[PDB]
A paper describes a structure:
DARPins are engineered proteins that consist of 4–5 structurally similar repeats that stack on top of each other, forming a compact protein domain. DARPins combine all potential advantages of single domain binders over antibodies: they are small in size (ca. 18 kDa), possess high biophysical stability, have very high expression yields in E. coli, can easily be genetically encoded for in vivo applications and are devoid of disulphides and hence well suited for applications where they are expressed in the reducing cytoplasm. Structural investigations showed that these DARPins bind to different but slightly overlapping epitopes.
To connect 3G124nc and either YKKD or YRLK we chose flexible GS-linkers. Therefore, two linkers of 7 and 11 aa named GS7 (GGGSGGG) and GS11 (GGGSGGGSGGG) were tested for linking 3G124nc with either YKKD or YRLK. The resulting four constructs were named gc_K7, gc_K11, gc_R7 and gc_R11 according to whether they contained YKKD or YRLK and the linker used was 7 or 11 aa long. The complexes crystallized under various conditions with different unit cells and one to four complexes per asymmetric unit (AU). All GFP-clamps form 1:1 complexes with eGFP, in which the clamp indeed wraps around approximately half the eGFP molecule and creates a continuous large interaction surface, similar to the superposition of the two parental DARPins on GFP (Fig. 4(a,b and c)). The buried surface area (BSA) of the GFP-clamp complexes is 1625 ± 72 Å2. Between 7 and 11 hydrogen bonds were found in the different structures. Hydrogen bonds of Trp79 from the GFP-clamp to Leu44 of eGFP, Trp79 to Leu220, Gln81 to Lys41, His114 to Gln204, Asp143 to Gln204, Asn156 to Arg73 and Phe226/230 (numbering for constructs with different linker lengths, respectively) to Asn198 seem to be the most crucial ones, since they are found in almost all complex structures. The structures of the GFP-clamps confirm the intended design: both DARPin-derived domains overlay well with the parental DARPins when superimposed on eGFP.
Numbering used by the authors:
A (entry chain B): 2 to 64, 68 to 231
B (entry chain A): 13 to 310
Write the structure that this text describes.
Amino acid sequence: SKGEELFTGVVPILVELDGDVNGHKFSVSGEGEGDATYGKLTLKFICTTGKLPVPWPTLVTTLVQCFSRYPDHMKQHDFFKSAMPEGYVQERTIFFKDDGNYKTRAEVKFEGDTLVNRIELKGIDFKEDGNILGHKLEYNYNSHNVYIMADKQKNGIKVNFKIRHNIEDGSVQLADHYQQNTPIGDGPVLLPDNHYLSTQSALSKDPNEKRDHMVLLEFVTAAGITL
Amino acid sequence: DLGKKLLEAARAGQDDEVRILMANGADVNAADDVGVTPLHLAAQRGHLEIVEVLLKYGADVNAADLWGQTPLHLAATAGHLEIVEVLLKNGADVNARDNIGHTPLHLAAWAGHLEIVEVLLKYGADVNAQDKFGKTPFDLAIDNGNEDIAEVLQKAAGGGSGGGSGGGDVNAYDEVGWTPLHKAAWGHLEKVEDLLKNGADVNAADIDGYTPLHLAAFSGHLEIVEVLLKYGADVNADDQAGFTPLHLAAIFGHLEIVEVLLKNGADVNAQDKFGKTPFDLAIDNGNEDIAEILQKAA
Ligand code: NA
């Protein structure tokens, strides 16, 4: 009922990812702030185990949609905040066209005053000389439309979208995202009418960071339901 | 050590402690490990006395954090009007860019802060600035439902009144290939009709392959489905989409939409990216009446 009240101001964020892609294990930690009133994320991630064995852009979607801007006329359609503070489970399969897939399971919840995203990621069937394991993706990111619908079981939501990764040679690598979210708690949640989010992201580097890392600025707004 | 305390005092609004720390030699341009300075924090959190004293003591008004944000970006987003004005009077770059290429005017338009939009224009904000995804502040205001701001921004660009309801090249498209008609498909029937009457392309596909008819079927708007079809929409559009409008209608249980699609020649044998026909999807989603209709039409 009142989960949205936890997001009226700036909220600290922690992200922890445990990854294994084709047997290459790695860990990523992230921290920063989200300002859901304005759909804004300011985050920095580091690969704490060493070199990241996949391109950073391929992890962006895995690495907190409760910080999406939901405008006032769409407040009754914001599943993500309604599940808080107990949180939700977010599961994906991500199919990289003509390459392997990621499967992920995350818990997104408050731990004290911090919104924490804790993820396990498994990647299989990647080509050692493909675009992912061969690091042929540009260090940049596109704008996407994210499609949201209530699930048929009346428990949570399904989410579908296609991510476009620019390849160094000028082509585009599609990453087809299949997503499901369910509440962790027994409390009531908001099941939305169908709608979409529109995303903007910028990836950068911190000149004083010596570890493999990603600085991320992200702006996300919901839309599609009016008056 | 003094730098950290000054960052905290600025953040918490302790103007008495700010004055003390400065008298003890604190570096007014101290920065944390993500480039945030005391001026950033005071500007973002609305602490005007502290913004003023920091600027008096030489704080860098255009300091950028790791995300490219200046204090003016943060104050324009947070909605602190007098802080915006004070920053501009002390040399803030009115067209500074964050890492997505947003100027302060983009952010105020996005955030719905009309008075700040107007002050930024007064101090030289570029009304035609585009961020890295091609959006002007007008575009961000429109797409966020901030119609009053959109009306102001179109006027400031010399485009006359009426911007609140959209600035009208009926076949403009953004970087994801959305035309005005893609946006109107989400339940704006009168706008769909107006756009088509003024020459909008009914079959424009977005970057994912979706036509307005896909979006109208996904969002369940029967009367919009009907008028798109009346204006020649391809009932079986797929190509890059990987599914047709009838697949979508079969998923979400709108029997009347299925019926008009079939009436207009929708293909019951089309397969989506998983090899499913609309009948298969109707079964999978528990939409039994739709499944029976689709089987009759097999
Ligand atoms: Na104030």
